[PDB]
DNA sequence: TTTTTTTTATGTACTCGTAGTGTCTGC
DNA sequence: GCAGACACTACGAGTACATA
């Protein structure tokens, strides 16, 4: 997904919110909860296009007006966007402070003002708290739009302010049909990709479009080699990358399917890789699988959360600890009770 | 483009000044001596006006306009001295040096000093523009293998009787600080007019003013010298170096050690070192390190390193300077380490 | 047009007198007694949870302090000072979003300007909300003023986390704690609001909104606005139940029965069925924890079990009869840690899967088939 | 009393003479001896926790330095200088709020005027409040001033954490340390306050207030003012207990006993009563944990219990000698894990009940019965 | 006023002759020989810890260099130049509080006087005190002056941290590093100072005062004056012991010592005192954990003592030798669990007490 | 013998160069 | 007038350091 592709699974919610916004019964601060690539960006863009210019027929775009000319070119000064600096990774509180004071300085063109945060989960504590008063009491006809993948990660003091909207994932069969139309791959691979992305067709499309599929198949081959021999260290060659958290999530998914197979669950998530799950079930004990799953999830969370942490050291330590666990007579860890 | 050592500098200085002299290295004492000798011989040749400029992203850049080629009003030959930053020149400093070199003339002698330039910068346009006109002086700190010979040579320079034990003590206390060593020799000459130097006072007129680098610490770890490793760690902590640079320097070598130990069971270390492109200085050191350590010790080391990294970048605590110490003892001549203390 | 913008209930229904509070009586009694007598202080620090009323309480305190009727426990909206305080544009009430301006320079400028006499107001009230975000330099700057301020200066601070504030600042102010609102108070306030707004509602929807508000009235109002937007202009039980993903069937009960029976196939089939209908996982885990709590209570006292879950009483009675208390406690602990772990491994489905697998691990899953 | 101006107790009752200062006998005796005998040092640093007197004692020393009756250890209230000091309008008591004037330029300005002599005073005092707030350059600008000050200038510094000052400053200035006030001292001072001010009070409420603001008297004064506000202008036990959110020790120990003797119905009844009273559940867990810790301490030594819990002292002993310490360790661990995991329970009431039920199930002596069917 | 006149012990007793400086023998001897042979470097930079005489020795150097009797290690008090050095009003001695005159404007103004000949002295002597803090451009001006210094000007730089000084100034300055004063020398001079004044004293009290100061003479004298004030005009052992107990800070070490010996009453008294001396309980427990870590590490190799434990080495060596590694490991695990468990406990004093009780319960002491 | 090597977010001082502002001096 | 000079004050930028 390059940029802002309209999604049919977004059409219903969209009009509903328009019905709320057109009648003047819409909350100023709306927090979107959607999966990565679910299309929340397109929803926010369409909403802002509706809001920020002369009233169109009442639906669709805003026609051919000054608002559309400025918005499409990205020149509208009443369309404030909060995006992390590419050199950094988080929304500096200075950017939010500047945006809030600029909003306080009244609009420039006719109409309302729209502030859009490209991702709420990337807000630091100071940046998140710098928005509290502005959300509580917007100056005049100010509408916010915050996108997130889970509202619980966001501060409780901010989740109170915003009316929460939920973009439910599309039904799995419909998403499978859509992806098969969009991408020519076998049904099993399609299903595994969809379940890997928690039913987010946009995320699955992003996974297929890039090299992520090649990385996943390389990781699968490396796991197939490593599982019987017990030489998990080689997996490092496939795990160290800028997308390390996603590959660790894939590994955790494989371990989850292995435990599922041990319990014989009717449903799995790595459908198109039965050989690896069979090998993992055969060669590894359920307690060992659970321990490895816990360690992998913990390492993924530590990599994703703590900014600046060294990827290579953590991945190597995880692999060596797994190596230690595979050896007989080694006490496995348990969740912190 | 002449290349020289400080000891040979007089040989070039008494022959005739070149267009410019470049004083590259990391020894304050050697660079200071070379610069002072060049300035002294220039004054003997009739150079009187000296201007010193420090190369900085915000410093003045009037040095270009300072080449008026019109001093003739007084006609005092000028010497220009430039101080490069810690990391060397940047692009902007590159073209500044280009335009300074383009305006060089006979009446002006240019003295350039700073940290040794890397290969990426040794091909810079200005440095090439100094070809056939410049004399580089190599001033790099002698290592502990070569340091005592240098100390003995300087003691003979001052006509002082240096004992072997005194030489060893001074080498141990003032490692990596040549200026401190010169000051100590002067101070001990002042304390003892007789000229001899023996233990009873050279162990008294000395301090632990040694300056180290993370590479020295990693070398101490590889050679398994616990006492030197701990002393180096203490000196680095006192100096104030950031612990993250220590963590990275040790992480690189520890990961290489883990990979080499894993591959040693199937391939001789001689081919493994060449495949991993290990320099001849470090091949034997890493061979001894591999022969000393087992897989379990390396696994414990990496576990401790990971815990230190987490407690540094997540809790922001100051316990790192302790944990590194344990990691030191974890990899030297039978660590005899623990689990709760690290795990 | 009375609503140029949507005056959301979280803003339109801000209290204007002391009688509009939903029951913060412990602090209101102290405030009324202090205003009624001469006992007035120069530093009030209201703390507590989100959306509980401390900013509104502070604004009401300012209104009572500055109204030209006098120092009245009940402020009068007729007063011009109250008219200006309820809106913006009051020369005396200086409201500073502390998180917006954390720099010590702004605090130093404020403390330079505090010296001047108030304009036409009895007390120059400084209302600093979200005070816990101020930089430590500003915190230390706010020490010597709060201890011996000019008589005409009153400081009102509000924060959601007293611990983050330095102990020195807490030591100079009156600390009021605003307890989280109970279910009944929130439900009564919501029914009063909806009756005043001529919007239809149902008691079950109001009860669900109060339950999900987690003790914060602003959460209740936001959920009510969610229901209004997604309920076609009325608060209906179906709309709120659907939006909250709450459980009306025995899915949680069947899931915990399968888990305690250690039937992994049944557990995973039920979890897959739950994923099919898109049941919210956090609510499922909360319901399972509540059911396990009821199991423990009935094990301790069978009479306590007699509750709303009457139609399913036999099942919980059998589970209490057949399961030791230690296993129930281990199950509750595992599910609770799992609930702590939902906002980890962003795909929450596999998070609940992890929690269920950990819970299942305690009992033997041996392939040994025995009755 | 008669003052219709209800001045805050934190402000009205600031110490006037060295006789009005409670506690801190160390600093009080040191200053009295160093001012009666002479030998006044040129820099003081009062280091202590919050609300112990880090500033008022400095003002008392300032009064004692330049008084009309000469250098005296008893600051009078008759001469103009002392009253001007108390009003804060005194000419020579330059009160440097170091938090505001923290930049090095302001410190240079302060040092520039040091030699310009005092006006209507034996000494000029530079009372620098919160010195731990100055910048590094500001800290170091005044070194040679502190080491060799003029004969008429005396510094009086007051910081909460001296560890943040550079070590040389700790060298130059005298290091006076003020210990946190004890509970009995706080109770006596509050009794003095509520007797001088005509407010009816009850001793149990005063003890509760003193304990709830441990180590800091200004905390106690603020809590007492807020309790006067909460009550009908009188410090009663009910008002203080309801305000603090604390639960009376007798009833918490009653819950603890019901837990120890495995009486589930009594535990449930007490929980229901606490729910009816509106006491915060986490506060109930906190009180139970504190009582269990006190039980452990009295197992360590019977002297660990002061008069504070005297009302139930006997019961305390009857819990110390009847159960082994390992049971206390298990109980403390269970209740503490419960407190840690409370915020994620279905409800705070549900979480507290489940924690108590877990402590009841897992406790060794007479545990809960297990199902008859294996 | 009506209290006669009593100065400060820190400012008084400052040495006026090289024989009155106690300790730092190597620096004084080197300076004496350099002045005797006429071998004087252009710039002398003093360095060392606080309160070891760097400024005082520099002032003595400035007095000696301009003495009319000649450059000597023992300048007389007779010379009017020497007397003006005493009073602080000497035209040829330029005392620059570089901690206050950091800006390049003032430094350049005061360094533009190098062109002027001394008024009544052989050498124009600059005493730039606290040189470590100084603007970068002021360092440039000072370096330009020192590169081509007039023959009638000598520099006397003083500082506490020589690291902050640029290397270009260090390479041009003869650096003299001063050691932290040994305890015996501190006690000896404290005895002599107390005897020269009309103050009674006690031997154990004197030893306690000497040990309390961390090798710095100014610290020792400041504590001496404070104890005299608290001691009712007498340096008595009980009064100074109580004073130092009030000012006692290294609580964690005593806590470890009491915990490892299973002394319940002692550890309870220590934690009560640490509560009265208002501190942070998390910081105390972290310090205890770190001390236990160090004790565990020292048993593996003595070199772990390092430099930080120079004033703590005596007790740490005994603790490391006398305690088995397993007990130290168990104590470290208990304290780590307690620190993880502390915030969720009741008020943190209760949690620290409970963790200490947990650690104490391991030993069979009853 | 030669290169080798870093974790950010937010804030607070400090000091120098360049410009903007006042004002007033014999110009 | 008077505008330049000269002061004087403020602002950006580069650097160093602190706390979390
Ligand atoms: N005690 C209360 N009485 C009535 N409404 C309340 C009360 N507390 C909160 N609210 C509602 O919550 C909204 C926000 O309240 P606010 O006072 O800002 O809470 P906070 O203390 O977190 O700042 C108000 O607009 C009002 O609708
Ligand atoms: N030792 C004390 N005796 C009597 N009152 C005290 C004492 N310490 C603090 N207080 C009370 O606290 C108020 C302010 O005390 P203060 O001396 O400012 O503490 P700090 O040391 O923090 O500046 C005083 O007005 C007084 O009522
Ligand atoms: N070597 C010493 N001999 C005698 N007194 C000393 C010595 N070092 C420090 N002192 C004492 O400390 C006081 C201040 O000493 P000073 O030399 O100013 O220390 P600094 O090195 O920090 O400038 C002196 O008055 C003197 O009493
Ligand atoms: F939302 Be409130 F100010 F805590
Ligand atoms: F209120 Be005190 F000066 F900390
Ligand atoms: F005067 Be010293 F440097 F403390
Ligand atoms: Mg608020
Ligand atoms: Mg104070
Ligand atoms: Mg000094
Ligand atoms: Zn349009
Ligand atoms: Zn009114
Ligand atoms: Zn008086
Ligand atoms: Zn003389």
Numbering used by the authors:
A (entry chain E): -2 to 334
B (entry chain A): 1 to 343
C (entry chain D): -2 to 368
D (entry chain C): -2 to 371
E (entry chain B): -2 to 363
Could you share sentences copied from the article?
Because the sliding clamp is a closed ring in solution, it needs to be opened and placed onto DNA by a separate ATPase complex called the clamp loader. All clamp loaders are pentameric ATPases of the AAA + family (ATPases associated with various cellular activities). Here we describe a series of structures of the E. coli clamp loader in the process of placing the clamp onto a p/t-junction.
The Closed-DNA1 and Closed-DNA2 structures reveal how the clamp closes and yields insight into sliding clamp release. By comparing the Open-DNAp/t and Closed-DNA1 structures we infer that the clamp closes through two motions. The only difference between Closed-DNA1 and Closed-DNA2 lies within the contacts between the clamp loader and the sliding clamp. In Closed-DNA1, all five subunits of the γ-complex contact the ß-clamp, although the D and E subunits lose substantial contact relative to the Open-DNAp/t state. We propose that the Closed-DNA1 conformation precedes the Closed-DNA2 conformation in a trajectory towards clamp release. In Closed-DNA1 and Closed-DNA2 structures, the clamp makes multiple direct contacts with DNA, primarily mediated by Gln15, Arg80, and Arg73 of clamp subunit I, and Gly23, Arg24, Arg80, and Gln149 of the second ß-clamp subunit.
